[PDB]
Design a protein around this ligand. Structure first.
Ligand SMILES: NC(=O)c1ccc[n+]([C@@H]2O[C@H](COP(=O)([O-])OP(=O)(O)OC[C@H]3O[C@@H](n4cnc5c(N)ncnc54)[C@H](O)[C@@H]3O)[C@@H](O)[C@H]2O)c1
Ligand SMILES: NC(=O)c1ccc[n+]([C@@H]2O[C@H](COP(=O)([O-])OP(=O)(O)OC[C@H]3O[C@@H](n4cnc5c(N)ncnc54)[C@H](O)[C@@H]3O)[C@@H](O)[C@H]2O)c1
Lengths: 283, 283
């Protein structure tokens, strides 16, 4: 047949760069798109960093293989040229409705008929975007996790409009780039992982904010009770407290009470979690 | 000082027997109370079984130590005699409000002033029972997990009335019988562990019932995403599907929809989980 060969990634931020690099590392012809030459310069820095991480952390990356993947990546700040022969476009632009709306409007026009579109969006449903694409049969979500080389799940989630054959092609692509395809059958805000994790972290937050128990007690209870390696608060530190704060602040009232607790006790003290070396725990 | 030495366990069922045995194994003077001689005969069978499990599974139980703990246990079907010199009474009678109400009414009268009372209740708050005890300062919850020798958490949870010194004595007792004391500061339905686990299992159930993803997909997502050894549905099988059914049937509407799903697809087919060798998974 034909299969996916040319992949364009829109956006070269934290996830955009990991997606493009993982994809290049697995032999696909990757184009990295971003808005201007300065953004593309930064993208190149991220790729060089990722090549270094892979050579130390990823099977098969040693002895120049990651550096070769680095060298094969194409850079473009011209959307029309970036997607001109694209089999797959993975959209990883900022989590902005209007910004994504603008992109898919243009993308739908500029991209050849064959091109499959996939959003990496965490908070926007593909149904919120499918309209702006102009090709609902070729639109779906392909959702990655930060540090794709280790957290290698790829959540595949389409709309009722998505073409079954497109879906399966994206599933095969995901396996081809070393991911574990997590196949959703219907749209769900938060996909699978976030749908499972948020309720756990919310329950932990509630226990803390209502003064039922301290973080350490809550965590050891979870590790002993389920055999899990890390408790909810260790997980908060990994997620990053700034991130947890933002998410909780736009959630229910109990979670908003947690946000204030984070803001007062951690964020305002510079204790942001694993990143700064200290959050609920000191590292 | 004095400390806890004489412990009476009320009820010799699944948890009553494990509590009494773990306590006897750690050198305390244990009396096992139950309603009649036939119940006490069954209790003795459970203890003999537990001694066997310990000798294979528990450090220090080999070479007759567990058999010696077995031999030291006293049996009583006379409540007054059973608690006559009790320092601690652990209540593990059926999860029946009126049945527990009846017990604490009598217990409060028959037990010497020194006696601390602790309920192992999963669904009834100590505040729902504290009134019937007559000694609110000496009443609190000490909540164990099935298979106490491996899941060795002991959740300690009192009322506003509970005496701080009693609480700490129960904490020390818990450590003395080889448990990890999980100290709650305020009453909370479900203590810590259940408070964390139910929301996770509910979210998994919702994903299943609404047809978002299958059990296997949901489980691998959790294991990969959090590094957990077992996913929600593996956990359901361990909990037991009959149990999950009962709990879900008296929960919210989404959970009740899950109960029906369990009833139709698993319970009615004899697939009850780990116990029967097959639930969501085949073992
Ligand atoms: N950050 C995460 O952990 C995470 C997890 C899962 C999914 N995602 C999703 O990925 C996307 C965000 O990516 P990120 O946060 O990893 O990187 P980022 O948000 O830090 O970077 C955004 C990229 O898009 C570029 N960009 C900015 N404006 C643009 C525009 N107008 N047109 C095209 N590109 C533009 C930015 O310059 C940058 O290259 C969102 O859909 C987000 O929901 C992020
Ligand atoms: N089963 C669990 O996994 C679990 C977990 C945590 C806490 N608990 C709690 O422990 C108690 C239930 O114990 P279990 O389910 O492990 O054993 P069980 O319920 O199978 O056995 C109940 C024991 O109480 C006895 N009993 C019956 N009527 C009595 C009465 N009228 N007066 C005194 N004793 C009576 C029964 O004969 C038996 O000895 C409840 O408080 C329950 O919430 C159970």
């Amino acid at each position: 047949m034909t299969g996916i060969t040319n992949v364009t990634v829109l956006g070269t931020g934290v996830l955009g760069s990991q997606i493009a690099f993982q994809t290049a590392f697995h032999g696909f012809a990757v184009t990295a798109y971003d808005i201007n030459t300065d953004a593309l310069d930064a993208a190149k820095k991220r790729f060089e960093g990722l090549a270094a991480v892979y050579e130390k952390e990823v099977a098969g990356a040693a002895d120049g293989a990651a550096q070769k993947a680095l060298g094969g990546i194409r850079y473009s700040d011209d959307l029309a040229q970036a997607v001109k022969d694209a089999d797959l476009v993975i959209e990883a632009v900022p989590e902005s409705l209007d910004l994504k709306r603008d992109i898919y409007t243009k993308l739908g026009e500029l991209a050849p008929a064959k091109t499959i579109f996939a959003t990496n969006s965490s908070t926007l449903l593909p149904s919120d975007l499918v309209g702006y694409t102009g090709r609902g049969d070729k639109f779906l979500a392909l959702h990655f996790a930060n540090h794709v080389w280790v957290n290698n799940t790829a959540e595949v989630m389409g709309t009722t409009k998505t073409d079954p054959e497109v879906y399966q092609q994206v599933v095969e692509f995901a396996s081809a780039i070393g991911m574990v395809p997590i196949e959703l059958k219907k749209e769900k805000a938060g996909y699978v992982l976030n749908s499972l994790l948020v309720p756990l972290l919310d329950a932990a937050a509630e226990l803390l904010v209502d003064g039922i128990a301290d973080p350490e007690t809550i965590d050891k209870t979870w590790r002993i009770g389920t055999g899990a390696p890390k408790g909810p608060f260790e997980i908060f530190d990994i997620v990053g407290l700034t991130t947890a704060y933002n998410i909780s602040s736009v959630s229910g009232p109990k979670q908003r009470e947690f946000a204030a607790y984070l803001k007062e006790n951690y964020i305002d003290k510079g204790k942001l979690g694993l990143a700064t070396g200290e959050g609920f725990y000191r590292y």
